[PDB]
Each structure stands twice: as structure tokens, then as C-alpha cells.
Design an enzyme around this catalytic site. Structure first.
Site, PDB file in Angstrom:
ATOM      1  N   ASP A   4       0.842  -1.189   0.000  1.00 27.99           N
ATOM      2  CA  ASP A   4       0.000   0.000   0.000  1.00 27.99           C
ATOM      3  C   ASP A   4       0.882   1.245   0.000  1.00 27.99           C
ATOM      4  O   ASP A   4       2.097   1.173   0.207  1.00 27.99           O
ATOM      5  CB  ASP A   4      -0.946  -0.024   1.211  1.00 27.99           C
ATOM      6  CG  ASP A   4      -1.941   1.123   1.207  1.00 27.99           C
ATOM      7  OD1 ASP A   4      -2.337   1.576   0.116  1.00 27.99           O
ATOM      8  OD2 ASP A   4      -2.310   1.589   2.307  1.00 27.99           O
ATOM      9  N   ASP A  33      -9.296   3.980  -1.431  1.00 26.55           N
ATOM     10  CA  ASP A  33     -10.166   4.337  -0.299  1.00 26.55           C
ATOM     11  C   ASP A  33     -11.476   4.929  -0.811  1.00 26.55           C
ATOM     12  O   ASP A  33     -11.661   6.147  -0.890  1.00 26.55           O
ATOM     13  CB  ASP A  33      -9.456   5.307   0.640  1.00 26.55           C
ATOM     14  CG  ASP A  33      -8.232   4.704   1.279  1.00 26.55           C
ATOM     15  OD1 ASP A  33      -8.225   3.471   1.497  1.00 26.55           O
ATOM     16  OD2 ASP A  33      -7.279   5.458   1.556  1.00 26.55           O
TER      17      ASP A  33
HETATM   18  N1  LIG Z   1       2.559   9.435  11.078  1.00 28.35           N
HETATM   19  N2  LIG Z   1       1.329   9.497  10.345  1.00 28.35           N
HETATM   20  N3  LIG Z   1       0.496  10.517  10.923  1.00 28.35           N
HETATM   21  C1  LIG Z   1      -0.929  10.648  10.508  1.00 28.35           C
HETATM   22  C2  LIG Z   1      -1.936  10.151  11.330  1.00 28.35           C
HETATM   23  C3  LIG Z   1      -3.278  10.268  10.951  1.00 28.35           C
HETATM   24  C4  LIG Z   1      -3.599  10.878   9.742  1.00 28.35           C
HETATM   25  N4  LIG Z   1      -5.031  10.993   9.365  1.00 28.35           N
HETATM   26  C5  LIG Z   1      -5.752   9.775   9.023  1.00 28.35           C
HETATM   27  C6  LIG Z   1      -5.434   9.487   7.539  1.00 28.35           C
HETATM   28  O1  LIG Z   1      -6.689   9.316   6.902  1.00 28.35           O
HETATM   29  C7  LIG Z   1      -6.848   8.003   6.391  1.00 28.35           C
HETATM   30  O2  LIG Z   1      -7.394   7.184   7.064  1.00 28.35           O
HETATM   31  N5  LIG Z   1      -6.340   7.691   5.028  1.00 28.35           N
HETATM   32  C8  LIG Z   1      -6.640   6.397   4.405  1.00 28.35           C
HETATM   33  C9  LIG Z   1      -5.360   5.532   4.267  1.00 28.35           C
HETATM   34  N6  LIG Z   1      -5.719   4.325   3.488  1.00 28.35           N
HETATM   35  C10 LIG Z   1      -4.563   3.453   3.204  1.00 28.35           C
HETATM   36  C11 LIG Z   1      -3.899   3.032   4.536  1.00 28.35           C
HETATM   37  C12 LIG Z   1      -4.818   2.146   5.405  1.00 28.35           C
HETATM   38  O3  LIG Z   1      -5.853   2.926   5.931  1.00 28.35           O
HETATM   39  C13 LIG Z   1      -4.008   1.560   6.604  1.00 28.35           C
HETATM   40  O4  LIG Z   1      -2.887   0.880   6.065  1.00 28.35           O
HETATM   41  C14 LIG Z   1      -5.463   1.003   4.615  1.00 28.35           C
HETATM   42  O5  LIG Z   1      -6.447   0.403   5.426  1.00 28.35           O
HETATM   43  C15 LIG Z   1      -6.137   1.493   3.316  1.00 28.35           C
HETATM   44  O6  LIG Z   1      -6.657   0.392   2.607  1.00 28.35           O
HETATM   45  C16 LIG Z   1      -5.111   2.242   2.446  1.00 28.35           C
HETATM   46  O7  LIG Z   1      -5.711   2.644   1.231  1.00 28.35           O
HETATM   47  C17 LIG Z   1      -2.591  11.373   8.902  1.00 28.35           C
HETATM   48  N7  LIG Z   1      -2.897  12.009   7.625  1.00 28.35           N
HETATM   49  O8  LIG Z   1      -1.857  12.645   6.928  1.00 28.35           O
HETATM   50  O9  LIG Z   1      -4.203  11.987   7.087  1.00 28.35           O
HETATM   51  C18 LIG Z   1      -1.253  11.255   9.293  1.00 28.35           C
END
Ligand SMILES: NNNc1ccc(NCCOC(=O)NCCN[C@H]2C[C@](O)(CO)[C@@H](O)[C@H](O)[C@H]2O)c([N+](=O)[O-])c1
Ligand SMILES: [Ca+2]
Ligand SMILES: [Ca+2]
EC number: 3.2.1.207
Lengths: 151, 83, 597, 105
Positions: free
Chosen positions: C195, C271
Site C-alpha cells: 500500500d 479508499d
Molecule cells: N505518522 N502518520 N500521521 C498521521 C496520522 C493520521 C492521519 N489521518 C488519518 C489518515 O486518513 C486516512 O485514514 N487515510 C486512508 C489511508 N488508506 C490506506 C492506509 C490504510 O488505511 C491503513 O494501512 C489502509 O487500510 C487502506 O486500505 C489504504 O488505502 C494522517 N494524515 O496525513 O491523514 C497522518
């Protein structure tokens, strides 16, 4: 979605530059004096009439009724990227033949037909035919753009 | 003698009991195989509690009965764990 | 007179374009496949149902999910471990509290004949205690900046560096990291999910890497961007092959992709959201990927973001059950939606969708073998099969699987029916639930209920099914086949069936496989070899033949090479014109013929 | 923006300057084109004349929306053209950020 996070074409400087070139008379023309027929490809020099930048067109008929067009700078300051590891093989070629010629045109035949390629010298243009049926044209709207590597 | 489907619907020959093809709507003609979708397999499980399992778990390669009798022709050798 | 003009504008590189002249769309499929290759043949388990979310919390949770499927009589091949299974998003590690014994967890799943998928992303936590980071730093295998320092961005583990997957030495390092000695806690039933491999960089421009980062050979990141993810996918797939000594076929799901990614596994549409229009758009999105060679496509069943209402979840299961990559997945903050958590009426509809998918596995597997050998898409727009029917050129609420099944899933809340376009002059279509025959071309109004999945089999086709649904595909792969023969108006039909061991490259290295041709004409069904090079030791046999559109014969006669002629019993329904031939009992490896007198 | 370039807070030193390439293709008789994923858009690609080109640049778009040409996670630069009479394909083998304009006559 937060759209401001991602460039529109107008915010992508190369897209803005390219997209501002609108359909018209192409400044590129093929130098039929430089035409060379080879084992795998036809190569001919192209020139921008205003800037005098020299490009090389590598034209290939391929087995399985495909055509490949590659264009690169004639004398580049640095090599341009060519995508590796995507093609599973060096595609098998078919022989090109000059089967027609005039002052502003060369007609090429792929193997023994029915596919033919018409290279127009001025303005530069390519037409792909099965016999006499036009399948597709290249640079017909004169939108070819090749920014050469500057200093 | 023939075999009568347990729900009473139909009657089939004796050699169609446990012949690995589902002939009975209630699955009662295949108590020992995986052939019927609604059948059941009885595990005696001497030394533990007897158990019924889905016919689809007969010879599926997974040990469903502690006595291991659901796996008799699958390449999985189930040890007896009823204790 | 009509004409379409196309203009491509790229930031760097040369102009390099292939014109693929057809004339049929299948010629184009062959032309493009000769250039970039064909769909990797998925191991059979990967065509089953995948159960995922962010995140199953620990080993006990994973085993409770596994047991929940069996306690509620629902099949499932794979349970997935998202990023919270690792040690603080240090990939190739395991959380020491919640996953202390991964081998024992994998052994319990193996005892249920199920698999596990673990996520491995390409960003590497900048951490001097992290061995992966130390090795890549010491060997200079990271993407660099112009001043020669290793690039550092931000992703799930915080500050992170990015291996240069354009460097073949890095891809070889990555592949070797999947050895069972290097990836401690992994086992042969553990597969991989790549991913964030665009690559995603949380503090980068457009959430990705800087254009002027520097890769192997001095090329800039702007030059290579769109194949970075492909290289991740490739190196992971090679790792799974290598760790087995070159025997096991890989399974890798990848988010980012490029031309050629079909060679390395599956992709999904990222997503999405738990909403009806996102359910609808899974068809045109996976169709667009299918047309360009990526046949192993799907969307998160139920939607990744937000909580779907139960009716939407049912319809999404029914949609996903007929799409190539079939995975339920969900965001960290969603409610649990394992399918047995719903009220019984929704459970039963979901169970029926799962059963239909598992029963069709021989069909799915054969379509993917045809994709692997020929380059033909598995899931197809109607216009691919009906290139002269101009009313199909935009259809995207319907699709075909191969040439045999037409699918119109319900995709509106509270629907009472659907409008199904059945194409083809002098074509017939069979409602596979009612066996009602319908002539083309027409738009059929089909009433639906919650349990309905509108599916039609095309006249002239033979679809193989495993009617004995078990808990996973490994359990089924020696079971007998039922043949569903849909008679054309001329009384003919044909189909194929590919079989092998289900998971190795032996079909290729040892020609250990079967490709059978089934054909019906006159009043005779014949099984013959469609590839004589393929031989296989298998107990699979033909337990049943279902013929739609047939009259009642006087007698049924089976002839097999090596056996005397025998009689088969049969059942006929005069209302539906459906003929069922009881227990032919013949090996799938044998030539045979059944004659209806 | 032809050399050193900035977008929001991010800077591209762009040491090699403008190097973009582009070329147009005409498909007589074709009214329907398909392909160039990945976009949350209709199967039959739309004309781009009044709006944005379709963009091919592998990008992570949080909560992406439907029916728009923004680039999503994958890029396959392959376009299929279909008519009653013929099928054609164009495979633009380029790994850099790529924009695709589509117009009808
Ligand atoms: N150190 N990081 N700090 C930090 C902490 C929180 C946040 N906010 C939440 C992000 O929002 C989401 O949830 N985006 C969907 C991500 N989807 C990916 C990954 C995954 O969710 C897990 O592997 C798989 O399940 C999905 O299939 C795959 O497509 C952020 N940010 O920058 O948003 C940065
Ligand atoms: Ca029986
Ligand atoms: Ca069992």
C-alpha cells in the site's frame, strides 16, 4: 477531497505551456534528405522551423500489426528517460519499404501489406492506413511539442 | 429393499445411500459423505460428547471431530483428541 | 464524419507510442499483451473471499474472526492484517504484545486451510533500532536528494525514508527480505499487501515525493514517478516466489500501478466510501482497468470510509461476489462489519452471495487462465462482446464475465426491480435463478428482492461449478464438477475448464494441468482435450450435468474411453425445460460423451 | 515556473528546465474512447475541451470524489477506441506526469 492540495493543469507549468499550444500549423517538418531505412526502423530527422532544433523520428512497423513511433533529440545535452522493465521483450519488427514518393511525402509499406504509413515532410505528419482506409493520423492538429534540454 | 427419504418425500435404491451423490432433498441419503448441501455427519466421539457436523466438512481436510472420523479419505490424518 | 482527437502531454522522457491497429478489440488485447505481458495466474485461494479491516487487533481477534466464519457457515479464504499488526509501522515486524506468536497464528489458520495477508508498505521508519532501516541506509539503497543525503518524508511511522525501487540491487534486497529466515514469523500461507506505493508522502507536494529527488542512474523522481509503485509490486511478488524456491505462485495486492502491473498480482480502487454511488462506480473503474490488461481488480466491499447501512452492505457483497478481487475492508474508525454481525435476513443474503462466488470458482479460474494465456480481460464491457450494438457502447451498470455470464447487480436502496439489457440478435439468455429463457435484444424489467443478484447465462455456453461449497477453496479443489449447459437456439453450446494444483508454477514448468473442452451439438455432450500437453493427477470427476433449454429424452447414454457404455438416470422439468443428468461419475481427465436419445 | 517552481510550500529546483513532450492523434470514425485509468469516472471517457484533461500521476487522494478527472493511485497510459467498424489502441509509454486531452469533431 481537498482539491487545492493537487495541481490543476494551469498549476502544472509544463501542462499550462503545452495546453496553450492550440490546433494549427505545426512548425515541425521532416528532412527527407536524412531518411534512412534500416533492419528494424526508419529514421528521419525532424526540425523545428523557428528554433532549428533537430529531432530524430524512429518509425517501426511491428509484427502483429502495430506501429511504434519514437522521437528523441538528435544531439541531446543529456540522455532522456526511456521507460525500462515495462515491455516484456524487444518487440519483433516488420520490414518497412518505400512504396511511394513525391516532393512532400513518402509512403511506406509494412512488410507486404496491407498496412501503410504516409510520412508527410511539411508540415510533419503521419497517416496510418490499411490499404486505402485511413485508420489514424499523428500530428494532424499540429500539437506536437518537444521542449529540448537547455543549458 | 429400498431406502426411504427421511422426510418421507421419495424412495431410492439401497445402493444410492452414501454413493457420493445427493438424491434426497433432506440430505438423508448421504450421512457419511459430503454430497448433500443440507446433510449432517455424526461423530460418535467415544470418551467425549457426540457431535453433528455439516456434510460439507466431511473430508474437507480439516479435523472437525475429536475422534477424527470426518476425515477418512482426504490426506489429513486427524489424531484422536477427545480426552 | 465523426472523429475523436487525443493529445498526450508528459513532463519528461522521450515520445514513445505504440499504435495497436486491431481490427477487433480482441486483436488489440493480443497486441497490447505481446508488449506488456499478461495477467499473472492467481493462486486459486486468492479468487475466494477476503476478510479485512483496519485493524484486527491481535492474534485472538484473528482466530475469533476465523471461527466466526465457520460458526455462521460462511466461506472465507483469507484474513488480512493491516498496519497495526506491526511494531509501530516498522514493516516486516510484529507487535510484541498483540502478535507475539505469528507462526502459531499462521499454523492455526493453516489447520483451517486458510491464508493470511500482511501489509508491507515501501516507506521505512527512520529509526536506528530498526534493522531494515539500518541495512538500507548502510548500503545506500534509499532515494536521495540533490545534496546526496537520504530523502526523508512522513508517513504512518512518522519520519520515514523511501527505498529506491528503481534500483535493481534494491529490488533484489527487497525480494530476499521475504525469505522465511529474514521475515521472521512469516510462513507459506502468509501473503502480502503493498500500500501507499505511489509513493505517499504526507508532507510532500501533492502528498508524494519531490520531483527533484534523485534515483539510480541519476534520473530524477519526475522521470520515473509512475513506475515506482510497479517496482514495489514486482519486487514483492518476486520475493514470494523466491522464498519458496521458485515453486509457489505469489499473491500481492498493490495500490499504485502502471502498464505491466498485471504481471505481478491484483489491484484495487483504493479508499472508496460507504455510499451507493461508490458501489455503482466500482463497475466502470474495474472495467477501465480490465480493458488495459489489469484483470485482477476490485473495490472495498462495503466502502472503506463510513458505515454502510445493512442493505447497502448486502448489495455490495452481491456486487463484489461477481468482481475479480473480492475483499471486504474498512477504516479504523468504522463499526465492525464481519457479515455475521447483521440481522439474519441480511446475513442470509450475504451467505448466498458468498456461496455463489465459491461455486463459480472453476469458472473464475478458467477465465483467469484464459487471461494469462491470451491477454483477454476477465470482466468485460458489453460492447466487447457486442461490438456492433451501438446501444452498449456506454453501458456501465452491467458487465460480462467472459462470454458466458451477464451481471446486473442491484445498486439502489429499496429497489423493486432492474432494467437488464440483454443484447444479441437471435441470442438467448437464461435467468440462472429461475431458468426462464429470454430472447435478445431487449431491455427486461426484472423484479428483485434483497436476495436477488440478477445473473444471466448466455445461450451456447457451458459454465463449470463446484456445487459443494466448503469453508475455503483449498477444501474444495478436489471436489466434483457440475456442468451448466445453456443451449443456443441451434441446440449447441461450448465451454472450457482449466485445472491444476491451485498454487504452484507446475502447470508451466511441468505441464501439470488440464484444459478441457466441453461441447454440445445435436443431442450429444462431449468432453475432449483443449491442450494435449496438459496432464494432471486429480480425483475431480463430473457429478452432474444441468442442461437449460432441453426437452425430455427417452434415455441417456454415457460413453467413456476405457469403460463400457452405461445408462444415466435423469430428471426433467417441463415448465422450465431444465434437464438434470445424475452422477455421470467420469473423471474430468477422461474423454467422454453423453448422448440424449 | 519553467525552471525553479513552487507549489504551495513545496519547491522544485527543476535543474534541467522545461523538457516536456506532447503529441496528438486523430481517430476518424471513432466516437467512443476508453481506458487511461485510474479515475473515479465513467467507462466511456468524456471530452476534456471545457475542463481539465485527464491526469495520469500516481497520487494518494484522501476521500476522493466521483465523476472527475483527478489522478488517483494508478496510471495506465493506454487508450482504446471503439466503433461499429474497428477497434484501435494507443499505448503512450511514458513514466512521467502525463495529461490527456480528448476532443470530438
Ligand atoms: N505518522 N502518520 N500521521 C498521521 C496520522 C493520521 C492521519 N489521518 C488519518 C489518515 O486518513 C486516512 O485514514 N487515510 C486512508 C489511508 N488508506 C490506506 C492506509 C490504510 O488505511 C491503513 O494501512 C489502509 O487500510 C487502506 O486500505 C489504504 O488505502 C494522517 N494524515 O496525513 O491523514 C497522518
Ligand atoms: Ca445418494
Ligand atoms: Ca472435516
Amino acid at each position: 477531497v481537498d482539491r487545492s492540495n493537487f495541481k490543476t493543469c494551469d498549476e502544472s507549468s509544463f501542462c499550462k505551456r503545452q495546453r496553450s499550444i492550440r490546433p494549427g500549423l505545426s512548425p515541425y517538418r521532416a528532412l527527407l534528405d536524412t531518411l534512412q531505412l534500416g533492419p528494424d526502423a526508419l529514421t528521419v530527422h525532424l526540425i523545428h522551423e523557428v528554433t532549428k532544433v533537430l529531432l530524430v523520428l524512429e518509425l517501426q512497423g511491428l509484427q502483429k500489426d502495430m506501429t511504434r513511433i519514437r522521437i528523441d533529440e538528435l544531439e541531446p545535452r543529456r540522455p532522456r528517460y526511456r521507460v525500462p522493465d515495462v515491455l516484456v521483450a524487444d518487440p519483433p519488427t516488420a520490414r518497412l519499404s518505400v512504396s511511394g514518393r513525391d516532393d512532400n511525402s513518402v509512403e511506406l509499406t509494412v512488410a507486404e501489406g496491407p498496412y501503410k504509413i504516409i510520412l508527410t515532410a511539411q508540415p510533419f505528419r503521419l497517416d496510418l492506413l490499411e490499404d486505402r482506409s485511413l485508420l489514424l493520423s499523428v500530428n494532424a492538429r499540429g500539437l506536437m511539442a518537444f521542449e529540448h534540454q537547455r543549458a | 429393499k429400498p431406502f426411504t427419504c427421511l422426510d418421507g418425500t421419495a424412495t431410492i435404491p439401497f445402493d444410492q445411500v452414501n454413493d457420493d451423490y445427493c438424491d434426497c432433498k433432506d440430505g438423508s441419503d448421504e450421512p457419511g459423505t459430503a454430497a448433500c448441501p443440507n446433510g449432517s455427519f455424526h461423530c460418535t466421539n467415544t470418551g467425549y460428547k457426540p457431535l453433528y457436523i455439516l456434510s460439507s466438512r466431511v473430508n474437507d481436510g480439516v479435523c472437525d471431530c475429536c475422534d477424527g472420523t470426518d476425515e477418512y479419505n482426504s490426506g489429513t490424518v486427524c489424531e484422536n483428541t477427545c480426552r | 464524419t465523426p472523429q475523436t482527437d487525443i493529445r498526450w502531454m508528459s513532463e519528461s522522457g522521450i515520445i514513445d507510442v505504440f499504435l495497436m491497429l486491431g481490427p477487433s478489440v480482441f486483436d488489440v488485447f493480443r497486441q497490447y499483451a505481446s508488449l506488456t505481458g499478461t495477467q499473472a495466474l492467481p493462486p486459486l485461494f486468492s479468487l475466494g473471499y477476503h476478510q479485512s479491516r483496519w485493524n484486527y487487533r491481535d492474534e485472538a481477534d484473528v482466530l475469533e474472526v476465523d471461527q466466526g466464519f465457520d460458526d455462521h457457515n460462511m466461506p472465507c479464504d483469507v484474513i488480512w492484517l493491516d498496519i497495526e499488526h506491526a511494531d509501530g509501522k516498522r514493516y516486516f515486524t510484529w507487535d510484541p504484545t498483540r502478535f507475539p506468536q505469528p507462526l502459531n497464528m499462521l499454523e492455526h489458520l493453516a489447520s483451517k486451510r486458510r491464508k493470511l495477508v500482511a501489509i508491507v508498505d515501501p516507506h521505512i521508519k527512520v529509526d536506528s533500532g530498526y534493522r531494515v532501516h539500518e541495512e538500507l541506509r548502510n548500503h545506500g539503497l534509499y532515494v536521495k536528494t540533490r545534496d546526496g543525503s537520504d530523502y526523508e518524508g512522513w508517513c504512518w511511522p512518522g519520519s520515514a525514508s523511501y527505498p529506491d525501487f528503481t534500483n535493481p540491487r534494491m529490488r533484489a534486497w527487497w525480494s530476499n527480505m521475504f525469505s522465511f529466515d529474514n521475515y521472521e514469523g512469516s510462513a507459506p500461507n502468509l501473503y502480502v499487501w503493498n500500500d501507499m506505493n505511489e509513493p505517499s508522502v504526507f508532507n510532500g507536494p501533492e502528498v508524494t515525493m519531490l520531483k527533484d529527488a534523485v534515483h539510480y542512474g541519476g534520473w530524477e523522481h519526475r522521470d520515473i514517478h509512475n513506475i515506482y509503485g510497479l517496482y514495489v509490486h514486482m519486487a514483492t511478488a518476486d520475493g514470494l516466489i523466491q522464498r519458496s524456491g521458485g515453486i509457489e505462485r505469489p499473491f500481492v495486492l498493490s495500490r499504485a500501478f502502471f502498464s505491466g502491473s498485471q504481471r505481478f498480482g491484483a489491484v484495487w480502487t483504493g479508499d472508496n466510501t460507504a455510499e451507493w454511488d461508490h458501489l455503482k462506480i466500482s463497475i466502470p473503474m474495474c472495467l477501465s482497468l480490465a480493458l488495459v490488461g489489469l484483470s485482477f481488480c476490485g473495490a472495498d466491499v462495503g466502502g472503506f470510509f463510513k458505515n454502510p447501512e445493512p442493505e447497502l452492505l448486502v448489495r455490495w457483497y452481491q456486487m463484489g461476489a461477481y468482481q475479480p478481487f473480492f475483499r471486504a475492508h474498512a477504516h479504523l474508525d468504522t463499526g465492525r462489519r464481519e457479515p455475521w454481525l447483521l440481522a439474519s435476513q441480511y446475513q442470509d443474503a450475504i451467505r448466498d452471495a458468498l456461496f455463489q462466488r465459491y461455486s463459480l470458482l472453476p469458472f473464475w479460474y478458467t477465465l483467469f487462465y484464459q487471461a494469462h494465456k491470451e491477454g483477454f480481460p476477465v470482466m468485460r464491457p458489453l460492447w466487447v462482446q457486442y461490438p456492433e450494438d451501438m446501444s452498449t457502447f456506454s453501458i456501465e451498470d452491467q458487465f460480462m464475465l467472459g462470454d458466458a455470464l451477464l451481471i446486473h447487480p442491484v445498486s439502489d436502496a429499496g429497489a423493486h426491480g432492474v432494467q437488464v439489457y440483454l443484447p444479441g440478435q437471435e441470442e438467448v439468455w437464461y435467468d440462472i435463478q429461475s431458468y426462464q429463457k429470454h430472447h435478445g435484444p431487449q431491455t427486461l424489467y426484472l423484479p428483485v428482492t434483497l436476495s436477488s443478484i440478477p445473473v444471466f447465462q448466455r445461450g451456447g455456453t457451458i459454465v463449470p461449478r463446484w456445487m459443494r461449497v466448503r469453508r475455503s477453496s483449498d477444501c474444495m479443489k478436489d471436489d466434483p464438477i457440475t456442468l451448466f449447459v445453456a443451449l443456443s437456439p441451434q441446440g449447441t453450446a461450448q465451454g472450457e475448464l482449466f485445472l491444476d494444483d491451485g498454487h504452484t508454477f507446475n502447470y508451466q514448468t511441468r505441464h501439470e494441468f488440464l484444459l478441457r473442452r466441453f461441447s454440445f451439438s445435436g443431442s450429444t455432450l462431449v468432453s475432449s482435450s483443449a491442450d494435449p500437453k496438459g496432464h494432471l493427477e486429480t480425483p475431480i470427476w463430473i457429478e452432474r450435468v444441468v442442461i437449460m433449454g432441453a426437452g425430455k429424452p427417452a434415455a441417456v447414454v454415457l460413453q467413456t474411453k476405457g469403460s463400457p457404455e452405461s445408462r444415466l438416470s435423469f430428471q426433467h422439468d417441463p415448465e422450465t425445460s431444465v434437464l438434470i443428468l445424475r452422477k455421470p461419475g467420469v473423471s474430468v481427465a477422461s474423454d467422454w460423451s453423453i448422448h440424449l436419445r | 515556473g519553467a525552471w525553479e517552481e513552487t507549489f504551495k510550500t513545496h519547491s522544485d529546483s527543476k535543474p534541467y528546465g522545461p523538457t516536456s513532450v506532447g503529441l496528438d492523434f486523430s481517430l476518424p470514425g471513432m466516437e467512443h474512447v476508453y481506458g487511461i485509468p485510474e479515475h473515479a469516472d465513467s467507462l466511456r471517457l468524456k471530452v476534456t475541451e471545457g475542463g481539465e484533461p485527464y491526469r495520469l500521476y500516481n497520487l494518494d487522494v484522501f476521500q476522493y470524489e466521483l465523476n472527475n478527472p483527478m489522478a488517483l493511485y494508478g496510471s495506465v497510459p493506454v487508450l482504446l477506441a471503439h466503433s461499429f467498424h474497428r477497434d484501435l489502441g494507443i499505448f503512450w509509454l511514458n513514466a512521467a506526469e502525463t495529461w490527456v486531452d480528448i476532443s470530438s469533431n
